[PDB]
Design a protein around this motif. Structure first.
Motif, PDB file in Angstrom:
ATOM      1  N   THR A  24       0.785  -1.221   0.000  1.00  0.00           N
ATOM      2  CA  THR A  24       0.000   0.000   0.000  1.00  0.00           C
ATOM      3  C   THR A  24       0.826   1.284   0.000  1.00  0.00           C
ATOM      4  OG1 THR A  24      -2.014   1.004   0.873  1.00  0.00           O
ATOM      5  CG2 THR A  24      -0.353   0.327   2.506  1.00  0.00           C
ATOM      6  N   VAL A  25       0.161   2.394  -0.329  1.00  0.00           N
ATOM      7  CA  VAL A  25       0.782   3.714  -0.238  1.00  0.00           C
ATOM      8  C   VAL A  25       0.798   4.159   1.226  1.00  0.00           C
ATOM      9  CG1 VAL A  25       0.743   6.124  -1.038  1.00  0.00           C
ATOM     10  CG2 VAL A  25      -0.010   4.283  -2.559  1.00  0.00           C
ATOM     11  N   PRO A  26       1.994   4.486   1.757  1.00  0.00           N
ATOM     12  CA  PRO A  26       2.086   5.021   3.116  1.00  0.00           C
ATOM     13  C   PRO A  26       1.242   6.279   3.279  1.00  0.00           C
ATOM     14  CG  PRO A  26       4.242   4.376   2.338  1.00  0.00           C
ATOM     15  CD  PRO A  26       3.329   4.358   1.143  1.00  0.00           C
ATOM     16  N   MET A  27       0.587   6.404   4.433  1.00  0.00           N
ATOM     17  CA  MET A  27      -0.270   7.548   4.718  1.00  0.00           C
ATOM     18  C   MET A  27       0.449   8.888   4.508  1.00  0.00           C
ATOM     19  SD  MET A  27      -3.378   6.671   5.287  1.00  0.00           S
ATOM     20  CE  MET A  27      -4.333   7.682   6.407  1.00  0.00           C
ATOM     21  N   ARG A  28       1.727   8.949   4.882  1.00  0.00           N
ATOM     22  CA  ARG A  28       2.523  10.177   4.728  1.00  0.00           C
ATOM     23  C   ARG A  28       2.688  10.654   3.288  1.00  0.00           C
ATOM     24  NH1 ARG A  28       4.920   8.807   9.784  1.00  0.00           N
ATOM     25  NH2 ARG A  28       4.489  10.561  11.200  1.00  0.00           N
ATOM     26  N   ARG A  30       0.305  10.348   0.936  1.00  0.00           N
ATOM     27  CA  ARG A  30      -1.000  10.655   0.364  1.00  0.00           C
ATOM     28  C   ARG A  30      -1.318  12.144   0.463  1.00  0.00           C
ATOM     29  NH1 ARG A  30      -4.867   5.411   1.441  1.00  0.00           N
ATOM     30  NH2 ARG A  30      -3.167   3.869   1.545  1.00  0.00           N
ATOM     31  N   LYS A  31      -2.329  12.577  -0.290  1.00  0.00           N
ATOM     32  CA  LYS A  31      -2.838  13.947  -0.230  1.00  0.00           C
ATOM     33  C   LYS A  31      -3.685  14.151   1.030  1.00  0.00           C
ATOM     34  CE  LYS A  31      -3.038  14.338  -5.316  1.00  0.00           C
ATOM     35  NZ  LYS A  31      -3.999  14.357  -6.467  1.00  0.00           N
ATOM     36  N   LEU A  32      -3.006  14.436   2.138  1.00  0.00           N
ATOM     37  CA  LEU A  32      -3.645  14.626   3.444  1.00  0.00           C
ATOM     38  C   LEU A  32      -3.106  15.896   4.102  1.00  0.00           C
ATOM     39  CD1 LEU A  32      -3.428  10.944   4.794  1.00  0.00           C
ATOM     40  CD2 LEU A  32      -5.537  12.118   4.065  1.00  0.00           C
ATOM     41  N   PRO A  33      -3.903  16.538   4.983  1.00  0.00           N
ATOM     42  CA  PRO A  33      -3.433  17.774   5.625  1.00  0.00           C
ATOM     43  C   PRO A  33      -2.172  17.553   6.451  1.00  0.00           C
ATOM     44  CG  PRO A  33      -5.790  17.463   5.974  1.00  0.00           C
ATOM     45  CD  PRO A  33      -5.262  16.177   5.423  1.00  0.00           C
ATOM     46  N   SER A  35      -1.473  18.568   9.338  1.00  0.00           N
ATOM     47  CA  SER A  35      -1.830  18.299  10.730  1.00  0.00           C
ATOM     48  C   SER A  35      -2.005  16.806  10.989  1.00  0.00           C
ATOM     49  CB  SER A  35      -3.109  19.048  11.108  1.00  0.00           C
ATOM     50  OG  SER A  35      -4.223  18.532  10.397  1.00  0.00           O
ATOM     51  N   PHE A  36      -2.233  16.042   9.920  1.00  0.00           N
ATOM     52  CA  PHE A  36      -2.471  14.607  10.037  1.00  0.00           C
ATOM     53  C   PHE A  36      -1.323  13.880  10.718  1.00  0.00           C
ATOM     54  CE2 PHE A  36      -4.003  10.413   8.930  1.00  0.00           C
ATOM     55  CZ  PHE A  36      -5.375  10.602   8.805  1.00  0.00           C
ATOM     56  N   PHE A  37      -0.113  14.420  10.588  1.00  0.00           N
ATOM     57  CA  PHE A  37       1.072  13.747  11.106  1.00  0.00           C
ATOM     58  C   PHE A  37       1.780  14.566  12.183  1.00  0.00           C
ATOM     59  CE2 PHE A  37       0.315  13.158   6.553  1.00  0.00           C
ATOM     60  CZ  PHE A  37      -0.053  11.817   6.517  1.00  0.00           C
ATOM     61  N   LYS A  38       1.157  15.675  12.575  1.00  0.00           N
ATOM     62  CA  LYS A  38       1.653  16.517  13.664  1.00  0.00           C
ATOM     63  C   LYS A  38       0.590  16.655  14.761  1.00  0.00           C
ATOM     64  CE  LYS A  38       4.706  19.026  10.532  1.00  0.00           C
ATOM     65  NZ  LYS A  38       4.699  20.119   9.521  1.00  0.00           N
ATOM     66  N   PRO A  39       0.730  15.874  15.852  1.00  0.00           N
ATOM     67  CA  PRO A  39      -0.259  15.887  16.935  1.00  0.00           C
ATOM     68  C   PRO A  39      -0.256  17.192  17.739  1.00  0.00           C
ATOM     69  CG  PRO A  39       1.619  14.526  17.539  1.00  0.00           C
ATOM     70  CD  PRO A  39       1.811  14.903  16.103  1.00  0.00           C
ATOM     71  N   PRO A  40      -1.424  17.578  18.296  1.00  0.00           N
ATOM     72  CA  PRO A  40      -1.485  18.748  19.175  1.00  0.00           C
ATOM     73  C   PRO A  40      -1.011  18.412  20.588  1.00  0.00           C
ATOM     74  CG  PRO A  40      -3.681  17.827  18.904  1.00  0.00           C
ATOM     75  CD  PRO A  40      -2.759  16.992  18.054  1.00  0.00           C
TER      76      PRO A  40
ATOM     77  N   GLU B  37     -10.771  20.787   9.690  1.00  0.00           N
ATOM     78  CA  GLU B  37     -10.209  20.676   8.343  1.00  0.00           C
ATOM     79  C   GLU B  37     -10.937  19.581   7.560  1.00  0.00           C
ATOM     80  OE1 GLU B  37      -5.686  21.036   8.378  1.00  0.00           O
ATOM     81  OE2 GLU B  37      -6.056  20.407  10.442  1.00  0.00           O
ATOM     82  N   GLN B  43      -9.121   9.497  -0.623  1.00  0.00           N
ATOM     83  CA  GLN B  43      -7.781   9.160  -0.143  1.00  0.00           C
ATOM     84  C   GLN B  43      -7.771   8.020   0.882  1.00  0.00           C
ATOM     85  OE1 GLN B  43      -4.712  10.334  -1.156  1.00  0.00           O
ATOM     86  NE2 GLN B  43      -5.680  11.589  -2.743  1.00  0.00           N
ATOM     87  N   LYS B  71      -8.252  10.991  13.494  1.00  0.00           N
ATOM     88  CA  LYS B  71      -6.902  10.481  13.614  1.00  0.00           C
ATOM     89  C   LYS B  71      -6.534  10.453  15.088  1.00  0.00           C
ATOM     90  CE  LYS B  71      -2.493   9.461  13.065  1.00  0.00           C
ATOM     91  NZ  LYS B  71      -1.525  10.058  12.079  1.00  0.00           N
ATOM     92  N   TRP B  73      -3.827   9.434  18.072  1.00  0.00           N
ATOM     93  CA  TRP B  73      -2.544   8.987  18.589  1.00  0.00           C
ATOM     94  C   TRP B  73      -2.854   8.263  19.892  1.00  0.00           C
ATOM     95  CZ3 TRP B  73      -3.113  13.376  15.765  1.00  0.00           C
ATOM     96  CH2 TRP B  73      -2.218  13.578  14.695  1.00  0.00           C
ATOM     97  N   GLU B 161      -0.757   1.272  10.061  1.00  0.00           N
ATOM     98  CA  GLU B 161      -1.046   1.783   8.717  1.00  0.00           C
ATOM     99  C   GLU B 161      -2.272   1.090   8.120  1.00  0.00           C
ATOM    100  OE1 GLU B 161       1.628   4.916   7.826  1.00  0.00           O
ATOM    101  OE2 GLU B 161       0.671   3.893   6.142  1.00  0.00           O
ATOM    102  N   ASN B 162      -2.427  -0.199   8.416  1.00  0.00           N
ATOM    103  CA  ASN B 162      -3.474  -1.018   7.819  1.00  0.00           C
ATOM    104  C   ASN B 162      -4.480  -1.597   8.816  1.00  0.00           C
ATOM    105  OD1 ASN B 162      -2.463  -0.860   4.988  1.00  0.00           O
ATOM    106  ND2 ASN B 162      -0.659  -1.769   5.973  1.00  0.00           N
ATOM    107  N   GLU B 186      -2.147   6.116  14.950  1.00  0.00           N
ATOM    108  CA  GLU B 186      -0.708   6.033  15.217  1.00  0.00           C
ATOM    109  C   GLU B 186      -0.510   5.869  16.726  1.00  0.00           C
ATOM    110  OE1 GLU B 186       1.013   9.582  12.996  1.00  0.00           O
ATOM    111  OE2 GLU B 186       2.522   8.070  12.511  1.00  0.00           O
ATOM    112  N   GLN B 195      -3.798  11.743  21.883  1.00  0.00           N
ATOM    113  CA  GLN B 195      -4.238  12.950  21.195  1.00  0.00           C
ATOM    114  C   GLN B 195      -5.121  12.586  20.002  1.00  0.00           C
ATOM    115  OE1 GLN B 195      -3.323  16.191  22.318  1.00  0.00           O
ATOM    116  NE2 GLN B 195      -2.196  15.234  24.011  1.00  0.00           N
ATOM    117  N   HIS B 197      -6.997  14.441  16.082  1.00  0.00           N
ATOM    118  CA  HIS B 197      -7.485  15.480  15.193  1.00  0.00           C
ATOM    119  C   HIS B 197      -8.777  14.935  14.603  1.00  0.00           C
ATOM    120  CE1 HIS B 197      -4.400  18.545  14.950  1.00  0.00           C
ATOM    121  NE2 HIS B 197      -3.453  17.660  14.695  1.00  0.00           N
ATOM    122  N   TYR B 199     -11.554  15.436  11.440  1.00  0.00           N
ATOM    123  CA  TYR B 199     -11.696  15.991  10.094  1.00  0.00           C
ATOM    124  C   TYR B 199     -13.089  15.740   9.532  1.00  0.00           C
ATOM    125  CZ  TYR B 199      -6.599  15.911  10.446  1.00  0.00           C
ATOM    126  OH  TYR B 199      -5.297  16.087  10.867  1.00  0.00           O
TER     127      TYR B 199
END
Ligand SMILES: CCCCCCCCCCCCCC(=O)O
Lengths: 40, 204
Positions: A24-28, A30-33, A35-40, B37, B43, B71, B73, B161-162, B186, B195, B197, B199
């Motif tokens: 599969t295509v890694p989530m990173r 893909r066309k995603l915001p 913020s998807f990979f940067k937690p608050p 967002e 996707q 999403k 964490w 991931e899956n 994740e 945590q 987000h 969407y």
């Protein structure tokens, strides 16, 4: 042909030489915001 | 009101491990908790069930404002006396009978489905629904155990991931989609713990 079961799922990551799950295509990559990979 | 359509709002969602130390002492660890967002839904279709009743079918049928992607964490930092559970709370202006279907998915394939029926309680002019301490299924308990026994955090994220969860809350009588929530995961590295987000899922 690949397998999609529980042992195969963890086997694919633990022992990548014998991995036989769908590819599969890694989530990173893909066309995603951003913020998807940067937690608050 | 983030996870809210025109007809239903999920106020609370938490998955937890509760350990009974002794008859009067309980330690509870939260794996994930909720207490916008836009993402192009196309996707993520590959990570969820296809065909009739699958995510694309559900989305196409609408309403569009009922569809969300969360999403998480997840906080996995925790240790006969164990209870793995999930609790959630909802509010509606209407008195409906709702069904909540939770599908655990791996490489986009359904592995298990849990189906729960909930009735309304009147509360200050609106109506409340609660799924209280729903037992986490054996697959999920085993999955958590296997994840934690992996030597590296990057390995856990690789597995995740899956691994996805799809929650579809429906008016039982009418079959209207009240909320559809796609969950992606994740592992948390944060000092604050779990945590998230949230969407909105959109057509493009
Ligand atoms: C990364 C996995 C650990 C995070 C905890 C999983 C979140 C639970 C979501 C609720 C799924 C309930 C399905 C069930 O067991 O009936």
């Amino acid at each position: 042909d690949s397998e999609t079961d529980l042992e195969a799922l963890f086997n694919a990551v633990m022992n990548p030489k014998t991995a036989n799950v769908p590819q599969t295509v890694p989530m990173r990559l893909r066309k995603l915001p951003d913020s998807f990979f940067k937690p608050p | 009101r983030s996870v809210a359509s025109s007809k239903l709002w999920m106020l609370e969602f938490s998955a937890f491990l509760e350990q009974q130390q002794d008859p009067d002492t309980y330690n509870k660890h939260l794996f994930v908790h909720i207490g916008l967002e836009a993402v192009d839904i196309r996707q993520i279709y590959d990570k969820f069930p296809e065909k009739k009743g699958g995510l694309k079918d559900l989305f196409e049928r609408g309403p569009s404002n009922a569809f969300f992607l969360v999403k998480f964490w997840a906080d996995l930092n925790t240790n006969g006396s164990s209870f793995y559970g999930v609790s959630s709370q909802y509010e509606s202006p209407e008195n409906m009978i709702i069904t909540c279907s939770t599908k655990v998915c791996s490489f986009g394939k359904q592995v298990v489905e849990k189906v729960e029926t909930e009735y309304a309680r009147y509360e200050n002019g609106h109506y409340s629904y609660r799924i209280h301490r729903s037992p986490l299924c054996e697959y999920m308990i085993n999955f958590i155990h296997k994840l934690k026994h992996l030597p590296e955090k990057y390995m856990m994220n690789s597995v995740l991931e899956n691994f996805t969860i799809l929650q579809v809350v429906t008016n039982r009588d009418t079959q209207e989609t009240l909320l559809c929530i796609a969950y992606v995961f994740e592992v948390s590295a944060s000092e604050h713990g779990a945590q998230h987000h949230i969407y909105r899922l959109v057509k493009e």
